[PDB]
């Protein structure tokens, strides 16, 4: 599919409201596994289960192990701009 850019806002006390799976050590992208009701991603729209997250706030996720991607995504605050593509 086409690559999309989607920005949401996250307050410091909030999570992103997504679950991810995949990663370099499993030979697949960082994939959105679930979008959780009522949390920032759900309230924004534009992210979808099965999207690959290619980058977040300009930080490349294409060659990251699962744990590293968790670290990177968890460290984003405020404006969070996702670069995603449906694989």
């Amino acid at each position: 599919g086409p690559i999309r850019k989607v920005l949401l806002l996250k307050e410091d006390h909030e999570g992103l409201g997504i679950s991810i799976t995949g990663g370099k050590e499993h030979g697949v992208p960082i994939l959105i596994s679930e979008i959780h009701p009522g949390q920032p991603a759900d309230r924004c729209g534009g992210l979808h289960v099965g999207d690959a997250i290619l980058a977040v706030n300009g930080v490349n996720l294409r060659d990251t192990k699962h744990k590293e991607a968790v670290t990177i995504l968890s460290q984003q605050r405020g404006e969070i701009e996702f670069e995603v593509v449906y694989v």
């Binding site: 999570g15 679950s19 991810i20 799976t21 679930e34």
Partner: peptide
């Protein structure tokens, strides 16, 4: 066991 889903 190794693939997991992580909530963030």
């Amino acid at each position: 066991t190794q693939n997991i889903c992580t909530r963030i």
